[PDB]
Structure 1
Amino acid sequence: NLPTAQEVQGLMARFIELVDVGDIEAIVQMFADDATVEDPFGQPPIHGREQIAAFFRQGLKVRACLTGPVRASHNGCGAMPFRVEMVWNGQPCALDVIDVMRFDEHGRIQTMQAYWSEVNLSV
């Protein structure tokens, strides 16, 4: 059902766990079939599991960690701060991101928005 504030915290922490190990099929499954993703926010969205799997395969030697608590509301929404560590062309970098997610009545991510730009990059 529409996750409770407590459930949202758990689902969102799980999300970073999956991105960290790189289990693309498990990540993809966390999304609704017609979910949209806006990463980075400001860019046109990607819609549906096909495009989202492609999106995550493309991006995912990467590690991600929650750098603060997941902030959850009572209406199926949550926001969380985290860092991603990569190695861009031999050169290793870090990106500080904040994800805002809206879940559906099935506990699946209906919409996801990532806030970041080059100002949060450290390469």
Structure 2
Amino acid sequence: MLPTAEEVQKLMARYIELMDVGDIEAIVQMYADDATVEAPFGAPPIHGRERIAYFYRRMLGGGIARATLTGPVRASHNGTGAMPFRVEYFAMDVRVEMRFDEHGRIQTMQAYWDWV
């Protein structure tokens, strides 16, 4: 019932694809109704699709130039995966961990941030 390591690799690759073109609505679509986003990890957690959109509206909603992987997408056999990327508007480096539910949607996301 959980996404395979291969499905996780395609889901996380799709995430980067949409971040890089500033596709807010399609990113929010990847989240489960009651998902949690901890980005940056340590800041107040974001609960539910409406508030998670505010975060992507805040991150992409004035426009983005590019977002690109800086290493392999790593997937578990447990419906989770991890990938490092760099965003550009200005610049920031991000290490993201995602857990998927049995429907292929993001239940939880943690992003570790680094200043460029």
Above 0.5 in TM-score? yes
Matched residues in 1 for 2:21 and 2:47: separation?
Answer: 24
User: TM-score, normalization: structure 1?
Assistant: 0.88
- Structure 1 match to 2:8: 8
- Structure 2 match to 1:80: 83
Matches within 5 A, 1:103-118: 103-116=100-113
Q: For the aligned residues, what is the CA RMSD?
A: 0.9
Q: What amino acid is aligned across from residue 111 of structure 1 in structure 2?
A: T
**Are 1:95 and 2:98 matched, yes or no?**
no
SS of the equivalent of 1:75 reads: coil
| Residue-pair matches, total | 113
Query: Gaps spanning 5+ residues in structure 2: where?
Result: none
Larger radius of gyration: 1
- Structure 2 match to 1:121: 115
**Are 1:66 and 2:63 matched, yes or no?**
no
TM-fit CA distance, 1:104: 0.3
- Structure 2 match to 1:23: 23
TM-fit CA distance, 1:68: 1.2
Deviations 1:56-110 (A, max 9, x none): 1111042101111101100001000100112xxxxxx221110000000100000
Q: Which runs of 4+ in 1 moved over 4 A?
A: none
- Structure 2 match to 1:90: none
Matched residues in 1 for 2:75 and 2:59: separation?
Answer: 26
Q: What amino acid is aligned across from residue 113 of structure 1 in structure 2?
A: Q
% of aligned pairs identical? Answer: 77
User: TM-score, normalization: structure 2?
Assistant: 0.93
